[PDB]
């Protein structure tokens, strides 16, 4: 199944089951996400910063792994893992990787 994720129109494209690998994240998480769904285009909308998005998504192909993009500034991408609910673990991992 192909959904979409657009994020202030810039549309990002994955498979279900790469979200459902993290259940206990926003969009792993059927009930949380589908508040973000938009019955006229049928797809997932976020009013949200765009660059971060990359790492988010790319979070759950890559089976857990977090990085922040080079050119989205600690605190804005901070904030977004925090809306995502990216969880403590990799909270734990990011907070090390970035110094605090």
């Known amino acids: 199944e192909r959904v979409v994720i657009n994020v202030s129109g810039l549309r990002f494209e994955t498979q279900l089951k790469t979200l459902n690998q993290f259940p ?6 059927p009930q949380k996400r589908n508040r973000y769904y938009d019955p006229l285009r049928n797809e997932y909308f976020f009013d949200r910063n765009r660059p971060s998005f990359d790492a988010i998504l790319y979070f759950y192909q890559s089976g ?15 904030e977004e893992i925090k809306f995502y609910e ?6 734990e991992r990011y907070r090390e990787d970035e110094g605090f």
């Open 24 to 29: 206990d994240t926003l969009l792993g998480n």
């Open 64 to 78: 857990g792994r977090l990085r922040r993009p080079r050119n989205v500034p600690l605190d804005v991408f901070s």
């Open 86 to 91: 990216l969880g403590e673990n990799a909270f």
